[PDB]
Write a structure and sequence with these properties.
Chain B: This is CD-NTase-associated protein 12. Chain B: Keywords: Antiviral defense, Calcium, Hydrolase, Metal-binding, Nucleotide-binding. The structure is cut from a larger assembly and holds five copies of chain A. Helices cover 34% and strands 15% of the residues of chain A. Chain A is of the alpha/beta class. In chain A, the strands form four sheets. A five-stranded mixed beta sheet of chain A has the order 9-10-11-8-12, with helices on both faces. A three-stranded parallel beta sheet of chain A has the order 2-1-3. In chain A, strands 4-7 form a two-stranded parallel sheet. At the D-E interface, helix 3, helix 5, helix 6, strand 7 and helix 7 of D face helix 2, helix 3, helix 5, helix 6 and strand 10 of E. The structure holds ligand C2E. Ligand C2E sits between chains D (164-165, 168-169, 229, 231-233, 245, 247-249, 251) and E (164-165, 168-169, 229, 231-233, 245, 247-249, 251).
Chain lengths: 306, 307, 306, 306, 306
């Protein structure tokens, strides 16, 4: 599991990037250099980099001098432009504050560009005692670690569903419950409520049917929550008021990942499952982060995995 | 049994095709190179190619270099275009997601086309120790094994029967049964139901009569299932588990389809006709079990078994 | 749990070793060429060939033209010396009717060498279209098939222990039981009897204690059958008598494995388990073959697994 | 708290040592090069090597070209002299099947050192693109992983104490208790019995006092069973009997640990605790391995933590 | 018998090694040089060294000048390195305070290295009139004679087993006996006791059986002693209270010896007997040194040999 990190080179930036690969791998980061195992069918790294978004999460770049003077290329000509095309495409397919890079001293790229620092580091044939790259890597580990728990992906189709679900259902039900004296559900009068959100492991095809069977199987009866339209939710019967729900909105991301890749294959494919897991984990992270923002939701709304 | 795989080389790469034959056969894949024994009565490989669809399931080829300059041929002239003619006709008769290829480093064939990646390998006269071709064969096996369990054959006459059967009968009765409180079947009230589908080994001649004589001897009583839209006639066994049974009545469709697929001029059943029956039935089983494992109303309550 | 074949070849004739490995593996024959990961510990092929007698069952060698004409050699001063040395040491550690060979049609090694007619083949590029070599491999395969249940001819101590066990306990017990109606057996008549033999699933240090524990688990008494000295075995309390006994002589073969495998290693190794299981399989095969060969014990003794 | 490995190199080959520790820690082996903060109290690498006979488990070292050709050296008159003397000290204090060696393509070290296959590598700049070095480190890793759970070779007194304890107490008591139905046990019958062995988490001087205190914590009475002399153990009052005992023989190993270190210092250090607990874990592993090798105790005794 | 010392010179200190051999013999220290008769099967001195620990007790190294300049070697190269590897591995197999050395005037070794003073001596072809090396052999003697009774060998299994024996058994029985007014042993009351320990001449196979067979034929009956766990011992009846015991802990060192040497060699060997005697004498020395230091053990616990 863990976060996927991608470092890019044309034909010579291999080992001075593999050092960062190994150090990040020491921190349980599945960092895949551009030629480990995924990109073997892909003849070039450009067709891989055009698929880095929402597939290889964060990324780093390393460039040196040995591929900066003169060389002929196969797919392109004047390969000296291929490195900067790679850098620009990688920075465009990830977004700012999510795509990092470094370069060698004397690399024909500016030290700073687009508000992202691109330090130039030394040669130091063996790098383990080069305590200038080391601080940068120690920093990047903790900066990325801050950006798994923080889902600043508002453009992504998962996060928009997450924020819509949170703000328009969880916030609404919690605000409605703090209106009448304590709680008015199914005749009996409760005192406190802890909302439960159950995110499925795999979405498959349709979500409403799964929610229906899941609620039927666990002996859960409907409730009325009045707020514009009153909300229908689910409560467990065994005054604690353990409210339960499954996000119905996940059908949107289900269809999105179905259409995202050319799918002429009945049933679930491993790539489809991996994309499913990525989108759902980002949805879960965004939902938790929004939950941890509002004071009325600090502790009264919990999300669990089943 | 197992999957059937085809490999195609013109007249000089047959050795590196035999190597892939051996490696696939080590993974329980039945592999028939285009000159094993079946195609000997066939005068050329092109009739075998026009008889490869729905018969050899998946397909592969190996592209070479030593037959790429000039040579005279019997059926054709300028045989040097037959490598790409093979690669085109073979991706035609089998379709995408059912045809693969491997090619030499720098071979005179397209690097990629039609969404089918064609990985490259070098000659390596020490073939068994080339950890580039072996990786390609390993991942081709891993790709294939993901396509036995998932039947992407919507054009096939069996997969459409599977989709129709599921969507119009199994999903329909599953939706109908989750309408009334627990169960209302023949007056008596059970709690939960287990739909069971029985796919025969062979379809014989007619399916309705086979169902009638199967359920006359196993002593199962009929039931009325009323959906929102015509009621679905099913049968529930009497011995509170509600084990509903049914056999796909529509398998006679695929029986007739593969009777008309091949020229059947002989009365009675035939070995090749049996092979086509088994192929279509296993594809139907795969498609139905995949559609069952999709919808949550069907994953558990509906099970397909072999009688 | 299948037969193992060791294929030995020079560093330049490894292609034929690989091809024969594939051909034998097509018959469910676990084949280990001298260059697998198991032999990375050992330094040279001579060390791995020295202990091939019991570790690797049968074997086969391939001698090629490129390692038989000119090379400087490392262990010896001449590869021409080397190849005949490995052939000799292999044919010595395995002996007659337990080792074969192959070589090029033009090799100076003669066809018949103290037995086992050594066939010929040609360097025909890719070998999947050689009828001669394939026919050779096929009759080799049928040879191992016909000599896997025959047993041994004075080989590893499993067979001699099996012969001793049968001819000194089983036959004498059965003769004693048939010499008169099986009436007494501690005062209760039984008519027919069954003598069940239970092979311990692994050689576990001292073996009589294991038999005592296993028999005590089933609440099994001791009977007193008379034959020179009376023989004592177990009964399992009268239409058909049932009698049990566990091979106690396997302690000797376990201790023999202990000596053969030099061990300052305090514990069990995968190598020790492999040798133990192979030698128990040999003992079991010898015993079953020899009990179905005879007439008194054709049907009245059953060998099973615990 | 895992396996530990010590890697030593000259002041210039520290690059190779760093790469090897990277490779080993990628395969879950805690590796300490001589340059760490642990060896600051020691003066020279020879004095760090002074106590590596048992402190740092397995060890491997590296020699290069120009730390083995010409230099002045500080401790000796020649760096070649220093490297060969240091390798001699390591190979002596570690021995066979517990040490390994790597050396540069031009190194003058012999390919054989009274055994132990010496691999061979080169200065290929950054070491993440070295196939042969990676494979040899991988075989080392597999050897270490398949070797750490076996036992010892007459090494630190943990293994000899384990063998003595088992073969003089556990086997004797188990054999005496299975020699007859466990009926008496001070006048009350139990049939089956369980012989629970508790390993103390840490060694604190005298251990029989610790045993008495711990047994009194559970209100345990003493029993007497006859076997030479009657062996007295503790019971835990009856379908299945249960017996307890913690190794009293650990007093000898604790005193050995105290004597092997300085006397003037009072109070335990982190180093003492680490070495002590490591060797205690070794004793526990040896005991459980020997138990699963034996017959009576395979399923009838339990070794657990206090 | 007496102390055994191994001395090492490569090819030019042979006369210088024989002189130190003679001067150690003058103090009755049996000296085996590396090529008397034992090491004839060993092709090189390196495989002689790989068994020098615990077999040849002490050690002395002799350094010569004509073996320091230049000479091609067989097992190594640049015998300048081979002698130093010798001096390092010999120190690694014996350690500090158990390994001494002598070096020629101007020899390329430190004057003081690793806590071993390496004294200087010139050639002096007539060695018997050299009052420099005679004085140094004298101080070697007065160092060694202090180190037979003092067994500071806490690493060696014999010493740790002895420490365990004393501290866990003899101290406990002495403390229990000096508790009630005079004596309460088998009902009868005595006044003073002489506990006695019978060190076996040979490790046999299991000291349990030897203990029973020895105590049965002296008509010695068991005694009950109460201290955690009670103590069972042996007392003779013919008020002197001669209690008896036999060290049962010697089983561990036994199995350690027969596992230390690879044993496919059934039966005892001269090497086995030599290790036997060395381990037994070390155990007896350690126990008798621990006994006289204490006050409760100096007088009432005597060690005897049958
Ligand atoms: N609760 C209990 N445990 C037992 C008994 N006998 C042996 N053990 C356990 O087995 C350890 C080693 O026993 P050993 O090899 O026979 O060698 C033993 C033995 O030769 C002797 N020894 C120890 N305890 C006794 C004893 O209670 N009676 C006698 N006669 N000798 C003893 O000292 C050696 C080391 O003893 P330890 O350090 O104590 O460690 C002992 C102890 O943990 C017993 O009667 N009761």
């Amino acid at each position: 599991m863990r976060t996927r990190i991608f470092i890019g080179s044309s034909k010579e930036g291999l080992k001075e990037a593999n050092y960062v690969k190994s150090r990040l791998e020491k921190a349980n980061f599945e960092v895949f250099i551009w030629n480990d195992d995924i990109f073997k069918p892909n003849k070039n790294t450009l067709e891989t980099l055009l698929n880095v978004a929402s597939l290889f999460d964060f990324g780093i770049m390393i460039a040196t001098k040995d591929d900066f003077t003169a060389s002929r290329d196969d797919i392109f000509e004047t390969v000296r432009d291929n490195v900067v095309f790679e850098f620009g495409l990688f920075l465009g397919r990830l977004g700012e504050n999510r795509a990092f890079a470094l370069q060698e001293n004397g690399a024909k790229l500016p030290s700073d560009l687009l508000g992202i620092t691109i330090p130039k580091f030394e040669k130091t044939d063996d790098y383990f005692s080069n305590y200038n790259l080391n601080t940068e890597i120690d920093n990047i580990i903790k900066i990325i670690n801050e950006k798994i728990s923080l889902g600043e992906l508002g453009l992504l189709p998962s996060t928009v569903l997450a924020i819509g679900y949170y703000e328009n259902f969880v916030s609404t039900v919690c605000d409605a419950l703090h209106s009448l004296p304590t709680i008015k559900l199914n005749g009996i009068e409760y005192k406190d409520f802890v909302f439960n959100i159950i995110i499925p492991n795999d979405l498959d095809a349709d979500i409403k049917r799964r929610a229906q069977i899941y609620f039927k199987k666990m002996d859960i009866h409907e409730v009325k929550i009045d707020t514009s339209f009153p909300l229908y939710l689910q409560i467990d019967e065994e005054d604690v008021a353990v409210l339960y729900d499954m996000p119905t909105t996940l059908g949107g991301i289900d269809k999105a990942i179905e259409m995202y890749m050319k799918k002429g294959h009945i049933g679930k494919t491993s790539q489809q499952q991996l994309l499913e897991e990525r989108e759902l984990r980002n949805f879960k992270t965004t939902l938790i982060n929004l939950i941890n923002n509002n004071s009325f939701t600090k502790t009264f709304v919990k999300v669990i995995e089943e």
